[PDB]
């Protein structure tokens, strides 16, 4: 019931972690002195607060990513895991499922490939008013 951080804290911590993720750790008093070294923080109290939020962000990073932050190793990991390729799904083994109305499509476009035809479904009545 009181101490929220101002943006002057929050921005400085995020910027610290963006540049010096490696130096920073969970133990507060270590990285409290890191914050002194790598950044010209004019007051003692402000420094002391920043480090406090730096620790808090570290804890969030050690448990999935954070929205407003760009860690270099996490970005590379993301790049690796979203340029994945499997042996392909758009072939859909042999036998693709198709309807007669979608079969007539293929007749109109001149085709007779490997794909099964099946419908039964009588017009049900979609949603309810």
């Amino acid at each position: 019931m009181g101490r929220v951080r101002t943006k002057t804290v929050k921005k400085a911590a995020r910027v610290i972690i963006e540049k010096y993720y490696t130096r920073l750790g969970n133990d507060f008093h270590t990285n409290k002195r890191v914050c002194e070294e790598i950044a010209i923080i004019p007051s003692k109290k402000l420094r002391n607060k920043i480090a406090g939020y730096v620790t808090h962000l570290m804890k969030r990073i050690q448990r999935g990513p954070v929205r407003g932050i760009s860690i270099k190793l996490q970005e590379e990991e993301r790049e690796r895991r979203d340029n994945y390729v499997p042996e392909v799904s758009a072939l859909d083994q042999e036998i693709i499922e198709v309807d007669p109305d979608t079969k007539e499509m293929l007749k109109l476009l001149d085709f007779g490939s490997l794909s099964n035809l099946q419908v039964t479904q009588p017009t049900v009545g979609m949603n309810f008013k």
Binding site: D82, N83, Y84, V85, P86, V88, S89, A90, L91, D92, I96, V98, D99, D101, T102, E104, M105, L106, L108, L109, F111, S113, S115, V119, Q121, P122, T123, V124, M126
Partner: protein, 208 residues
């Protein structure tokens, strides 16, 4: 498009389309889109003339090729299905992407950081990527879109009739466009197939 001999249909492409489910449009049909449809089935799912889809797809390619400096084709997806696909398209094509949360006044505002003034858009859903589409009528920006049956065609100067709901189909459509822009100039044969898998473009719902 000129579906005349070389860049016509072929079976293997249609088989990909059918597997993606792109033909399966939607339940509601906008009166602008009625042009691009075979039928409706039972329950009530419209079906899209796949020839007609290709024709527009080729026409989109021909538009994108005509833009000389490739970078100033812009390629937007707001939704998180095209978000990967657009970025893979830009990577292949040499275009510029905008993957999600399109900032208001990127095409407007001289002052702004991300003020880009391109000669073309490629929008995923015109229903969802609507801000950039509107900005494209404060600058003289033409537009490509991947339109469903439901999709409204305000400002979309060349719609492509697709399933744009399903991720599979969206990625497929991006991959098909990427091929065709590259085929229509550059380093793809047409006789040979392409190295790139269409699954490269598909969105991953947190699976592993």
């Amino acid at each position: 498009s000129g579906a005349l001999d070389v860049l016509q249909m072929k079976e293997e492409d249609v088989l990909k389309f059918l597997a993606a489910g792109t033909h399966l449009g939607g339940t509601n049909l906008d009166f602008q889109m009625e042009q691009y449809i075979y039928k409706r089935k039972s329950d009530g799912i419209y079906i899209i003339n796949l020839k007609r889809t290709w024709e527009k797809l080729l026409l989109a390619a021909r538009a994108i090729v005509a833009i000389e400096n490739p970078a100033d084709v812009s390629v937007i997806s707001s939704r998180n299905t095209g978000q990967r696909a657009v970025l893979k398209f830009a990577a292949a094509t040499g275009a510029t992407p905008i993957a999600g949360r399109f900032t208001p006044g990127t095409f407007t505002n001289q002052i702004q950081a991300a003020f880009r003034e391109p000669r073309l858009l490629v929008v995923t859903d015109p229903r969802a990527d609507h801000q950039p589409l509107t900005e494209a009528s404060y600058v003289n920006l033409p537009t490509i879109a991947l339109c469903n049956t439901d999709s409204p065609l305000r400002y979309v100067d060349i719609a492509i009739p697709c399933n744009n709901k399903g991720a599979h189909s969206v990625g497929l459509m991006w991959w098909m466009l990427a091929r065709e822009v590259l085929r229509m100039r550059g380093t793809i044969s047409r006789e040979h197939p392409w190295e790139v898998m269409p699954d490269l473009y598909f969105y991953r719902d947190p699976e592993e």
